[PDB]
mmCIF file of C-alpha atoms in Angstrom:
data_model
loop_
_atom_site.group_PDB
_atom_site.id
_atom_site.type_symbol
_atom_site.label_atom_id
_atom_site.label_comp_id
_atom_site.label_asym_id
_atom_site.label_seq_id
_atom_site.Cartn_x
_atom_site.Cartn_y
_atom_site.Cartn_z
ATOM 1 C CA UNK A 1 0.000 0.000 0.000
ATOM 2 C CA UNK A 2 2.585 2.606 0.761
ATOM 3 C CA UNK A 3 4.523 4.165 -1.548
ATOM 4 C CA UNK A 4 7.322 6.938 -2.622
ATOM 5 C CA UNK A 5 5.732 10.630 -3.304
ATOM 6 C CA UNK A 6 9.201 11.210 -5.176
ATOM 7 C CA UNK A 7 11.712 9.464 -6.966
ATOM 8 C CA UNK A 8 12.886 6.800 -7.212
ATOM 9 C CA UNK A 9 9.794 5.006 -8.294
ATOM 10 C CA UNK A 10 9.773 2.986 -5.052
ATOM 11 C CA UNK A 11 6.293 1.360 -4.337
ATOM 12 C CA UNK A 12 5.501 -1.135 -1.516
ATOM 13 C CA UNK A 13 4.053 -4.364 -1.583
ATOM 14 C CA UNK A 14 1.556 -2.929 1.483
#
């Protein structure tokens, strides 16, 4: 579910 605002794309499984 969570996730970066910014870069890197970095997106978490959550």
């Amino acid at each position: 579910g969570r996730c970066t605002q910014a870069w890197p794309p970095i997106c978490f499984p959550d």
